[PDB]
Design a protein around this ligand. Structure first.
Ligand SMILES: *C(=O)N1C[C@H](NOS(=O)(=O)O)CC[C@H]1C(N)=O
Length: 262
């Protein structure tokens, strides 16, 4: 528990961590360039791609999407609620990020982003050449060791998140929406957020494949007093198909990474 190698050994699996202090440049890396399953964590970038489409076509966020005749994907807490009358594109983006909504992700990749291929192209176009999304929900969650489908690296995820808040892709209006969505994420209280002092503000997106004990979290962290953000990216997976994940391992890794870049 005092260092990342000991956390990983006791977890019995693979832990990948990249953190950077965007003010000082201090970074921390542990298997930062190895591949891990994305699970739900791509959904933050999907929401950002929808924001960019609206940036490039003002009004997209208010277009309405109807899906009355759909069999809703498991883990669709918002889209199942609104099925009777549809949802605005911007609320689908908010739902897929803040609630990890699976229906919202597939709907947006069916009608706006051009499938998993289009998701990958968006990431590629901002300079992320590690990210690949290959399949739809929920098959993208298989998390098979050695399978590079639907994977990225901890460092690539961190760097892409930084790009999305550092004026390289989204204008300041759309960046602010993206950052408010991340800060309002509902699913991360037991991961990176569990490692930060009260008073710091965290915007994060989690992922939990349900296979191979695979779970992750990436975030920007605002210490306050106008400090530049910390970026943290933490991915884990294990060898056995039905092994369970462990939130506390991610939180322990977060404490180490924060200590080394703060
Ligand atoms: C994403 O990985 N998922 C969607 C949903 N949210 O859990 S999450 O916040 O950790 O991402 C349920 C688990 C998982 C899935 N089975 O799709």
């Amino acid at each position: 528990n005092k260092n990342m190698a000991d956390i990983e050994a006791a977890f019995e699996g693979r832990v990948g961590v990249y953190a950077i202090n965007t003010g000082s440049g201090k970074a921390y890396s542990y298997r930062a360039n190895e591949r891990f399953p994305l699970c739900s964590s791509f959904k933050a970038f999907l929401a950002a791609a929808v924001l960019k489409m609206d940036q490039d076509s003002p009004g997209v966020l208010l277009e309405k999407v109807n899906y009355h005749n759909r069999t809703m994907e498991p883990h669709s807490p918002i889209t199942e609620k609104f099925q009777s009358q549809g949802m605005a594109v911007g609320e689908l983006a908010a739902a897929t990020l803040q609630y990890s909504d699976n229906g919202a992700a597939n709907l947006l990749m069916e009608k706006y982003i051009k499938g998993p291929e289009g998701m990958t192209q968006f990431m590629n176009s901002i300079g992320d050449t590690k990210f690949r999304l290959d399949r739809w929900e929920l098959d993208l969650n298989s998390a098979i060791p050695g399978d590079e489908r639907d994977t990225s690296t901890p460092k690539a995820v961190a760097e892409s998140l930084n790009k999305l808040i550092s004026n390289t892709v989204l204008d300041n209006y759309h960046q602010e929406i993206f950052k408010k969505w991340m800060i309002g994420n509902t699913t991360g209280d037991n991961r990176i957020r569990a490692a930060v002092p009260d008073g710091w503000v965290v915007g994060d997106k989690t992922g939990t494949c349900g296979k191979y004990g695979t779970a992750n979290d990436h975030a920007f962290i605002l210490q306050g007093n106008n400090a530049a953000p910390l970026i943290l990216s933490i991915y884990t997976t294990r060898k056995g198909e039905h092994m369970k994940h462990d939130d506390e391992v991610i939180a322990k890794a977060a404490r180490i990474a924060i200590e080394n870049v703060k």
